[PDB]
Amino acid sequence: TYKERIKSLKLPDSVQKIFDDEITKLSTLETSMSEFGVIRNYLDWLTSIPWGKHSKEQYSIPRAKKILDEDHYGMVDVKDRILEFIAVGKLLGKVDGKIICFVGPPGVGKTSIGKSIARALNRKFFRFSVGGMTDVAEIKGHRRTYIGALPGRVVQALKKCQTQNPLILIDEIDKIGHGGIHGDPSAALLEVLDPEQNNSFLDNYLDIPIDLSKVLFVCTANSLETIPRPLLDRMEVIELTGYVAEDKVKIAEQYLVPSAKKSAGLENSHVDMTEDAITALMKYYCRESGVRNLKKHIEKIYRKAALQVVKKLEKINVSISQKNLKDYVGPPVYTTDRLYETTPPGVVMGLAWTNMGGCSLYVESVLEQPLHNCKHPTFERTGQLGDVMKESSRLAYSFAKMYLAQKFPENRFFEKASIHLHCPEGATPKDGPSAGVTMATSFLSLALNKSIDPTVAMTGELTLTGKVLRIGGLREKAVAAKRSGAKTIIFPKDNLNDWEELPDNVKEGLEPLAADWYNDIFQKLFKDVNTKEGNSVWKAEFEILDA
Amino acid sequence: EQYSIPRAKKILDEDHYGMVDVKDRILEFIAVGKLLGKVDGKIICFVGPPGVGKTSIGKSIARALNRKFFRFSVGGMTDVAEIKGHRRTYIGALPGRVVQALKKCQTQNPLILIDEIDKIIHGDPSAALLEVLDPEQNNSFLDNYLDIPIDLSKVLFVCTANSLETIPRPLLDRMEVIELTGYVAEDKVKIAEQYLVPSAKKSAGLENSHVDMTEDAITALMKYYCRESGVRNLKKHIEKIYRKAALQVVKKLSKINVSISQKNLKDYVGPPVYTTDRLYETTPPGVVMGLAWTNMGGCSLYVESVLEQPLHNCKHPTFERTGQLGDVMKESSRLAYSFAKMYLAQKFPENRFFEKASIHLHCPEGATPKDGPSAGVTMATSFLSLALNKSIDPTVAMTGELTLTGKVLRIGGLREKAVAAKRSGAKTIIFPKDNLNDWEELPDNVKEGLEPLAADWYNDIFQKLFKDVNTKEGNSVWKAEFEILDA
Amino acid sequence: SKEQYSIPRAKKILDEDHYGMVDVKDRILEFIAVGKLLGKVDGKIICFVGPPGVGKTSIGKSIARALNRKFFRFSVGGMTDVAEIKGHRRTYIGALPGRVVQALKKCQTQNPLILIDEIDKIGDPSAALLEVLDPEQNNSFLDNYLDIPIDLSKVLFV
Numbered sequence A: 001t002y003k004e005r006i007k008s009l010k011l012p013d014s015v016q017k018i019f020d021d022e023i024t025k026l027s028t029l030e031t032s033m034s035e036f037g038v039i040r041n042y043l044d045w046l047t048s049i050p051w052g053k054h055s056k057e058q059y060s061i062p063r064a065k066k067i068l069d070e071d072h073y074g075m076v077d078v079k080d081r082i083l084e085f086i087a088v089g090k091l092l093g094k095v096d097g098k099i100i101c102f103v104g105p106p107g108v109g110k111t112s113i114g115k116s117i118a119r120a121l122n123r124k125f126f127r128f129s130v131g132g133m134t135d136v137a138e139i140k141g142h143r144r145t146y147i148g149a150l151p152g153r154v155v156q157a158l159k160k161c162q163t164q165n166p167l168i169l170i171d172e173i174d175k176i177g178h179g180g181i182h183g184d185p186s187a188a189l190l191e192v193l194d195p196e197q198n199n200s201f202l203d204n205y206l207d208i209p210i211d212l213s214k215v216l217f218v219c220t221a222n223s224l225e226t227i228p229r230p231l232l233d234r235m236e237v238i239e240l241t242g243y244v245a246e247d248k249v250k251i252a253e254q255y256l257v258p259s260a261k262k263s264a265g266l267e268n269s270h271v272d273m274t275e276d277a278i279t280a281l282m283k284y285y286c287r288e289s290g291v292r293n294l295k296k297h298i299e300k301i302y303r304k305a306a307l308q309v310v311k312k313l314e315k316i317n318v319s320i321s322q323k324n325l326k327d328y329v330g331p332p333v334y335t336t337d338r339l340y341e342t343t344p345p346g347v348v349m350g351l352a353w354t355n356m357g358g359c360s361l362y363v364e365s366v367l368e369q370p371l372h373n374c375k376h377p378t379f380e381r382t383g384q385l386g387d388v389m390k391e392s393s394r395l396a397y398s399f400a401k402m403y404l405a406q407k408f409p410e411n412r413f414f415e416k417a418s419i420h421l422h423c424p425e426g427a428t429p430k431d432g433p434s435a436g437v438t439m440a441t442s443f444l445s446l447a448l449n450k451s452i453d454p455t456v457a458m459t460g461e462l463t464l465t466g467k468v469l470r471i472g473g474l475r476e477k478a479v480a481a482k483r484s485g486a487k488t489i490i491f492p493k494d495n496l497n498d499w500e501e502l503p504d505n506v507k508e509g510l511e512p513l514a515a516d517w518y519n520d521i522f523q524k525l526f527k528d529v530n531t532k533e534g535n536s537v538w539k540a541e542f543e544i545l546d547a
Numbered sequence B: 001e002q003y004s005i006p007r008a009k010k011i012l013d014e015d016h017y018g019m020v021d022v023k024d025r026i027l028e029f030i031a032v033g034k035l036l037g038k039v040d041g042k043i044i045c046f047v048g049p050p051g052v053g054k055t056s057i058g059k060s061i062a063r064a065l066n067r068k069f070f071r072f073s074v075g076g077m078t079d080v081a082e083i084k085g086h087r088r089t090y091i092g093a094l095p096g097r098v099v100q101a102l103k104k105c106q107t108q109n110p111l112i113l114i115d116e117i118d119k120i121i122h123g124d125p126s127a128a129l130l131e132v133l134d135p136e137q138n139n140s141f142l143d144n145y146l147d148i149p150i151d152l153s154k155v156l157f158v159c160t161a162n163s164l165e166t167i168p169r170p171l172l173d174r175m176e177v178i179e180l181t182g183y184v185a186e187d188k189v190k191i192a193e194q195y196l197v198p199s200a201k202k203s204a205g206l207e208n209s210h211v212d213m214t215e216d217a218i219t220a221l222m223k224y225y226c227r228e229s230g231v232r233n234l235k236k237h238i239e240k241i242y243r244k245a246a247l248q249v250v251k252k253l254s255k256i257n258v259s260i261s262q263k264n265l266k267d268y269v270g271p272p273v274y275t276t277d278r279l280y281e282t283t284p285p286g287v288v289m290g291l292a293w294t295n296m297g298g299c300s301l302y303v304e305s306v307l308e309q310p311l312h313n314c315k316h317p318t319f320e321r322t323g324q325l326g327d328v329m330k331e332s333s334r335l336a337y338s339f340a341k342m343y344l345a346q347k348f349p350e351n352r353f354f355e356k357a358s359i360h361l362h363c364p365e366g367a368t369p370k371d372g373p374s375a376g377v378t379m380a381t382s383f384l385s386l387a388l389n390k391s392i393d394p395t396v397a398m399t400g401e402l403t404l405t406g407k408v409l410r411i412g413g414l415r416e417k418a419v420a421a422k423r424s425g426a427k428t429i430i431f432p433k434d435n436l437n438d439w440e441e442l443p444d445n446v447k448e449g450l451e452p453l454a455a456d457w458y459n460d461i462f463q464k465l466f467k468d469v470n471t472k473e474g475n476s477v478w479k480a481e482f483e484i485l486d487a
Numbered sequence C: 001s002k003e004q005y006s007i008p009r010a011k012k013i014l015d016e017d018h019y020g021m022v023d024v025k026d027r028i029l030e031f032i033a034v035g036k037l038l039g040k041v042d043g044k045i046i047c048f049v050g051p052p053g054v055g056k057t058s059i060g061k062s063i064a065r066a067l068n069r070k071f072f073r074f075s076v077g078g079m080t081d082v083a084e085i086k087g088h089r090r091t092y093i094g095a096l097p098g099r100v101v102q103a104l105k106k107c108q109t110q111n112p113l114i115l116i117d118e119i120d121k122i123g124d125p126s127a128a129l130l131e132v133l134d135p136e137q138n139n140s141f142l143d144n145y146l147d148i149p150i151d152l153s154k155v156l157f158v
């Protein structure tokens, strides 16, 4: 019936023999039975895979570069990786197989670059979602001639591409279900992504195994820690980070504005957004580390502009700027210095990195009591701290007590201080030891009645001896510090190399300070303390009542 | 077909009444499609509580574009085989919704309404609706059933959802959500009198000008019997009343015109069942109102801080919490404890209330689960109210998140909170200044009768509420209470 | 061939069957009144909600007596799939009439009453139930063994 495609597809020997046996067995089969329908459905599912149809690789380095940079602006690591792949493929007859994953917060653009890479490599694209996955039924497939059986999604993807060596982009790997009964997709993904096992995939629906060696498995994920170690072992990862304010403005003006303009179908040279409007929107209306909220705001504004311009068929051109910004989106939402421009004693700024990217959290230590009544020294902490951060809080408790009792002998604050520790935004879960120093500076500040120069943000892990250890992720923290108005950033010395690899735009406007021990932080912040001014601070509060 | 803004606006205004914002969004869509030679079948999704009518906009937009309306239920499909189609060679195969729709459209650019997105063996409907609703993969159907190639970009999928949590993120990021909110009392009364009363009257086989509902009667009906923002319960009640009226007129076999007033208000179908605005006018010290948001809508929870015993014969200051507070609300309660304890010392040094007081904190209706930091300032006001022995002007509502330093932070949802405050008889609402933007997006009908108070720090709230508490009487309130236990 | 419109006789018929079930009697009274105000009883299919054992199976026969139409009891739980049981080709040796065929030949009366035995005690038969109960599809059901069109929308179920 459809032997022409079989002849033209250039099948390997064994699979061709299998298909010829199947067709010559079906030739003598009577069409009346439903078994004929089942077997022809199997042949439809079988002949769909292009066993020998593959596209032609692209050899032009400048063409690949010009395709890549026309679609995205600042993500350079992926471009370099693609250029290395292109050069390696050109240097040999044909190279394929490597699997790459992208890790970053939402809005970076790791999903959008899939099509750009597919066009740059002159190959087709497919998108694969594993977010709601909880079983292996849709990965490896089922038995052949079940009435309700559906084959695996990988062979379906191959059919949709209808050409070998495609580009299959897995949407999520960190959102894979744990897996109870009916299947555990992690093992199926392990089998699929093994570089050497790809030659013998051995799908359940088709007993003949398909060659996945030429297939390019691109990957997208948010958090690296959720992925199990077996999966991460066989896959290479590239960290796609956030964008600076100037980089966000460049990305917006270059790509987001024309994309929203053409989505609403507005003629050029009629409606445009000025630079001040975009920078004001991003700075005073949004806080996310990507450009997604900016994109939705731009699309909504351009839809409103389209509605305005259609209804008229003083000016035929619409200009969007500061003076008419609060007519398209409304009053502003957030504020850069959102808590307070100044800082009372006991409050310390700090940085954090969550699934949504970099952010700034404050740490507030207060006396849950009058000036000094207490009659019992107690330490209380609230907020969604988590186990690691609660342990960091206790360690900071002990370290601050020892540090005062060493540096300032007769400062007896912790003898009868009932301290309450809170991290604002109490509905947002927090974790990680990166605030270990941040809390240590808080209590000390609360115990010295001194501010911490609100233009200063700090991070790092603290130990009982005062040593400051490495932290997992600095560039996002630095971007968050720059966004929130901090000019001085305190990071552990171990991250100094991580500070050197930062782009010149991230480092600009931020004053580095690599602290090995906590003494460096104390000297940087508590300067005017003369060992007698910061000593006997609560002399009146102890003599009059506490005796 | 053709995109004419005025006639579409008139059609939408005739079909629905209080959907000003949704009508504006639909007009935006029509204007966007006008400048293009063909609408590219962009997918529009509606998110709102059931009962607001989001299944009715389908007909209005279909006839505004002069197109047929199609309906599709996802809650009954689990397998993808019923979507891709079945060949006619099979004896047992039956046409699915996709095949039947493709047969009976008979015209390009159809419109299909999805029953629900919150309603998800040998089949995963999530993947099926993913490939249906994926704009990039939508164009790759290429079925061999039709010799001529066909394009799936002609379908304007319309979604339906109550809570955005159920929608997965991979679906959410490629889907545009249009939010539909509830209707205030007046809006729901107009919607009823204009669409539900005539439709239910005709359904019960009753021509108009036979039985009528007075304004007071219908308002009492939608107040004491209807609480949720939708009109499902209102429609059911109207249908039941008109069925009873039809039975009565059959029994009479006929005067004919009977009026439903408030003096004899629905005594044949029972008395009021839901009532909230009769608790108590005068609010005692330590009790304060606050607003909460749930999927049902807005509500008014009280917060009562009391002494377990009179202060003159109590010791060992303890803090107790009841109600289904949860972790975040308990942490907010502890924060309010600390903030009030520090605030009295800062303002009234000689008031030693918290030194020897055992406080008990409750939220009435202790069976309903609660959560969220939106009551952070609500609790902190109670303790001071209990400490200063001062009432809190019972005609005020309060919400906001509090920190240790004493700042009010942004809260998650002010429209339903404002509606609940208005429904509860409050004439003043205290909300964070960061939420002022939301206060400027509320319909103008909500804002009358409520005096806004945007506060950054708690000092604003304290000055607004505690005006007649000077530093001479504020720090000397118990006094004689501490003249007994200190000897 | 004609419907009964006398409410009092239906009330008296329902009275002797059960002692103090007044809400269901009243509801069927408004149902009959609504049908009286219209040309034909259509728009809703009567369905009862309650714990088992209160007698929601003799109600079908009671309503049949009140409406004075023949009663037929149909078991949906005997269905396995939505494809194999919904009829057979006429040209095949395996032709077999559907359940509607024997229901109609037993009733021999327009608008016969059909009672579903168990739905909450049973691909999936939900699709078949939707196809046979939704009035939008009952106008042109066209059973495989029934060449003549059958309008199931006029047919009332319990």
Ligand SMILES: Nc1ncnc2c1ncn2[C@@H]1O[C@H](COP(=O)(O)OP(=O)(O)OP(=O)(O)O)[C@@H](O)[C@H]1O
Residues within 6 Å of the ligand: A071, A072, A073, A074, A075, A104, A105, A106, A107, A108, A109, A110, A111, A112, A113, A220, A251, A255, A290, A291, A292, A295, B173
């Ligand atoms: N450098 C850039 N140049 C052009 N467009 C960009 C750039 N960075 C981001 N974008 C755009 O911003 C939007 C957000 O990207 P996208 O949603 O693909 O990424 P993501 O949020 O990391 O992914 P996901 O939603 O799958 O987790 C896209 O429209 C993308 O094209």
Ligand SMILES: Nc1ncnc2c1ncn2[C@@H]1O[C@H](COP(=O)(O)OP(=O)(O)O)[C@@H](O)[C@H]1O
Residues within 6 Å of the ligand: B015, B016, B017, B018, B049, B050, B051, B052, B053, B054, B055, B056, B115, B160, B191, B195, B196, B230, B231, B232
């Ligand atoms: N303005 C209105 N005019 C007419 N009918 C309305 C209006 N608002 C709501 N309704 C009715 O309320 C019902 C709400 O149903 P809906 O909640 O959309 O269903 P679902 O929960 O499946 O989304 C609709 O059937 C509609 O008939």
Ligand SMILES: Nc1ncnc2c1ncn2[C@@H]1O[C@H](COP(=O)(O)OP(=O)(O)O)[C@@H](O)[C@H]1O
Residues within 6 Å of the ligand: C018, C019, C051, C052, C053, C054, C055, C056, C057, C058
């Ligand atoms: N007034 C009554 N007193 C006692 N039993 C009754 C009464 N009315 C009905 N029943 C019983 O209820 C039984 C059926 O109840 P129900 O559970 O609703 O139906 P089914 O058993 O078919 O689900 C009948 O067998 C009948 O004997």
Ligand SMILES: [Mg+2]
Residues within 6 Å of the ligand: A104, A105, A106, A220, A221, A222
């Ligand atoms: Mg991601």
